[PDB]
């Protein structure tokens, strides 16, 4: 009955959803043909012939990456009109996908949202997978999240967005498209899980011993997170959480809705069987700064709220004994207006490994979604880049000549400058 | 419930430690896969001493393997029982030490111990009751001596009240295998005396003589020598894992065998050794084993018991035997060797008995001696050091890296102090 509608925008959304929807097929035991050989109803809607079709949306402005899905292994699982393709991409520009090319395809995408909501007898909310550094994932997303808020008022709008990395980078003008998309992620969003690519490049190096990873090695680690978050809705457990339930325990103010994502344990198949994976050890790897999936150190910042999602053979006694060890650590600091900062969600099912995967078969796992004040440091290095190039008026004619005014550059800097200003005000001890 | 952490340093120490892990895995009935295959239920009662449980009912050893080269590490990993170890504890460098104590202790070994102590702390601070440490190495090299004694110094520094058992292969008169061996032997005793509780000496010439006369083997390879060392090694710690009538742990032996804080170098032995030519003709009795202990040919160091005096004797028997014959025999040997044992210490001999013999034999005995006759090895090492140091040969390789000349004279002074203490307490009424 409870079910989620996933939205994938950009090239990142299609390729994250390529390695995400292969695990929803494998967790529920659904073949690529679309048939099995009530938990599956959260994403798979039954057909009278026995077929299960995902309730997702795939959006891009180019057909170069979705046509590979249409001619791949899963060409029969997805609905033919469920994958919307444009004809021309936005090409690293926020102006293109928000004003000029993003308008002719939004009528088809918004029609499928109104159709997928009709079969849903009860809808919990939306999940978004996109990228800040692109033209579609940040330009087409910016008016879609504006459009979804008007039609559906109080629905939850979660987000799994690819934050730009601190050092490595792909596009030249990613600080412009990162600035102007944060205006729509503040009032038209509800809770935004960011990850980047450098912090997962570090993980596959020193943990899984893979010297040369790709995106299909990164995408399955991101695909492991979202299946841990949703795991309470699908399978029976000692204490389930809900999408509305864990926003209340994690967002204290409507402008402070930016957590961090962490997953542990992450070890290969050979290294796992010589070690013992206790409940205390998996909950202690998450608090290390080397397992952050965003390049920020939480020693500089202060924890505000946290949530623990558990899977497998976990006993509630050892969770209480391991959390109480954490609270005696002087390294981990909490802000004085949150004396109780832990939310615990326990699920029975141990995680499943994919064939050809890099992670090992494990009995228990944990995924912490930590809100912290050490993200204003990450937002400092992006405005150090933005005004360093806006002062010389570089690349501005690409934006003004397509449909916005030049005044959107000044306000969107002034919009999120006060957003960093609000983080040190929260961090003051009461 | 008492735990011992094992460390393997140097090529000789690595190979002896691998043979030790094979021997005690066969004793406890652990196949190299990591499961349990035994017939008696007494093997699994005390397996937390040497092994950690893993996920899926498997067992892993509680040892770390450190060497500055990747050769012997690969040999151990590709060996018979190399699968049971854990791959995160395989800490190694790239550049060889070249049998240079300065390279082992000051430059190349300085950057690796920051990672060595991390896994040592991981395997140690999770233990319930850490009994002590057990390290395997050799004196005459640059890796087995330098970073070995460095690890001893730092572990003694950070755990003040524990016990250390360092099993060291020592230089020998006729079987010299290194050119700078007096220098790298004298440079490590300065740290071995200060920060070690029991140092067990092993001599290659004694192993060769045992394999030629008592065992009468025609081809005594290094596998056979390392098996002898490992079989003597496991005997002193049988009593921490197996039941018996008169139990005696490592601190029991330490208190009974260390009368003065700087006399803790021990000469060990195995007692039921025999050739299969005369195994049919030899009878296994407690008096026969008792006579077998005190044979000079049995002694696994190149020192004569006839050229000194005995401070303390320890004997750990294994098997089913009565106690009156043991006490009577090990009083009779002290009575018959009246002029050799010291008169200011009556009751020189401690006996312990365990209920489980080694596999393949009805009974066994491990003999450990602390005697004043061990001063001959230190005397000849000091004489070789002085003969080399008069002309300062092979010294620029040490002085060109950060080693001063005066530490050599300090180590020579400590050697002279040690042999002076031996002679003074030998000649005292």
């Amino acid at each position: 009955m409870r079910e989620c509608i996933s939205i994938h925008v950009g090239q990142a959304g299609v390729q994250i959803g390529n390695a995400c929807w292969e695990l929803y097929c494998l967790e529920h035991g659904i073949q690529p043909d679309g048939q099995m050989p009530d938990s599956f109803n959260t994403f798979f809607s039954e057909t009278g012939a026995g077929k299960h079709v995902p309730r997702a949306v795939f959006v891009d402005l180019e057909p170069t990456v979705i046509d590979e899905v249409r001619t791949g292994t899963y060409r029969q699982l997805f609905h033919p009109e469920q994958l919307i393709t444009g004809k021309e991409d936005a090409a690293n520009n926020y102006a293109r996908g928000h004003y000029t090319i993003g308008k002719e395809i939004i009528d088809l995408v918004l029609d499928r949202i109104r159709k997928l909501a009709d079969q849903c007898t009860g809808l919990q909310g939306f999940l978004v997978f996109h990228s800040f550094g692109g033209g579609t994932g940040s330009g087409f997303t910016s008016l879609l999240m504006e459009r979804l808020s008007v039609d559906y008022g109080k629905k939850s709008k979660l987000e799994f967005s690819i934050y730009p990395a601190p050092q490595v980078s792909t596009a030249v003008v990613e600080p412009y498209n990162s600035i102007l998309t944060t205006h729509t992620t503040l009032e038209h969003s509800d809770c935004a899980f960011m990850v980047d690519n450098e912090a997962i490049y570090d993980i596959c190096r020193r943990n899984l011993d893979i010297e040369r990873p790709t995106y299909t090695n990164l995408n399955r680690l991101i695909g492991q997170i979202v299946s841990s978050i949703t795991a309470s809705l699908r399978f029976d457990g000692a204490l389930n959480v809900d999408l509305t339930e864990f926003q209340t325990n994690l967002v204290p103010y409507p402008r402070i809705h930016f957590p961090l994502a962490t997953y542990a344990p992450v070890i290969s198949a050979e290294k796992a069987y010589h070690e013992q994976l206790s409940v205390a050890e998996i909950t202690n790897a998450c608090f290390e700064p080397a397992n952050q999936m965003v390049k920020c150190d939480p020693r500089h910042g202060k924890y505000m709220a946290c949530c623990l999602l558990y899977r497998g053979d976990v006993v509630p006694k050892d969770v209480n004994a391991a959390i109480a060890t954490i609270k005696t650590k002087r390294t981990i600091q909490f802000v004085d207006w949150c004396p109780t900062g832990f939310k615990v969600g326990i699920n029975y099912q141990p995680p499943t490994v994919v064939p050809g995967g890099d992670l090992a078969k494990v009995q228990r796992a944990v995924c912490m979604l930590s809100n912290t004040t050490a993200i204003a440091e990450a937002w400092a290095r992006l405005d150090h880049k933005f005004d360093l190039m806006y002062a010389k008026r570089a690349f501005v004619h690409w934006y003004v000549g397509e449909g916005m005014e030049e005044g959107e550059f000044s306000e969107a800097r002034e919009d999120m400058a006060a957003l960093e200003k609000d983080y040190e005000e929260v961090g003051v001890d009461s | 419930m008492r735990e011992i952490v094992h460390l393997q340093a140097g090529q000789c120490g690595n190979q002896i430690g691998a043979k030790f892990w094979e021997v005690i895995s066969d004793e406890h009935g652990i196949d190299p896969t990591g499961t349990y295959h035994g017939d008696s239920d007494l093997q699994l009662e005390r397996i937390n001493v040497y092994y950690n449980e893993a996920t899926g009912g498997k067992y892993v050893p509680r040892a770390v393997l450190v060497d500055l080269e990747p050769g012997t590490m690969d040999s151990v990993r590709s060996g018979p029982f190399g699968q049971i170890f854990r791959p995160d504890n395989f800490v190694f460098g790239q550049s060889g030490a070249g049998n240079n104590w300065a390279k082992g202790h000051y430059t190349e070994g300085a950057e690796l111990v920051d990672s060595v102590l991390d896994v040592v702390r991981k395997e140690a601070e999770s233990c319930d009751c850490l009994q002590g440490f057990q390290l395997t190495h050799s004196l005459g090299g640059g890796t087995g001596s330098g970073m070995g004694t460095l690890l001893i110094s730092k572990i003694r520094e950070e755990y003040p009240d524990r016990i250390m058992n360092t099993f060291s292969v020592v230089p020998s008169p006729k079987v010299s295998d290194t050119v700078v061996e007096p220098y790298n032997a004298t440079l490590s005793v300065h740290q071995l005396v200060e920060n070690t509780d029991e140092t067990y000496c092993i001599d290659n010439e004694a192993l060769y003589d045992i394999c030629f006369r008592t065992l009468k083997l025609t081809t005594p390879t290094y596998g056979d020598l390392n098996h002898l060392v490992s079989a003597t090694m496991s005997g002193v710690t049988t009593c921490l894992r197996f039941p018996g009538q008169l139990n005696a742990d490592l601190r029991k032996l330490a208190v009974n065998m260390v009368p003065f804080p700087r006399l803790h170098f021990f000469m060990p032995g195995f007692a039921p050794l025999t050739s299969r030519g005369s195994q049919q003709y030899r009878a296994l009795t407690v008096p026969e084993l008792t006579q077998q202990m005190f044979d000079a040919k049995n002694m696994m160091a190149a020192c004569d018991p006839r050229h000194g005096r005995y401070l303390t004797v320890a004997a750990v028997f294994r098997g089913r035997m009565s106690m009156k014959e043991v006490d009577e025999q090990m009083l009779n040997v002290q009575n018959k060797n009246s002029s050799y044992f010291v008169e200011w210490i009556p009751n020189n001999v401690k006996t312990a008995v365990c209920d489980i013999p080694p596999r393949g034999l009805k009974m066994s005995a491990t003999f450990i001696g602390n005697s004043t006759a061990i001063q001959e090895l230190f005397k000849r090492i000091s004489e070789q050091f002085t003969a080399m140091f008069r002309r300062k040969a092979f010294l620029h390789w040490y002085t060109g890296e950060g080693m001063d000349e005066m530490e050599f004279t300090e180590a020579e002074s400590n050697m002279n102090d040690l042999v002076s203490e031996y002679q003074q307490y030998q000649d005292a009424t």
């Binding site: 206790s278 205390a280 050890e281 | 239920d41 699994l44 449980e53 009912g57 995160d88 896994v119 999770s126």
Partner: peptide, 29 residues
Amino acid sequence: KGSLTLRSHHKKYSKPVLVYSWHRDREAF
């Protein structure tokens, strides 16, 4: 690394291996 996880306290072992509080865990059976 694999040592990057905490060194932790206590280890479960199994039921035939006797450890501290093996008697107290046996007493509830």
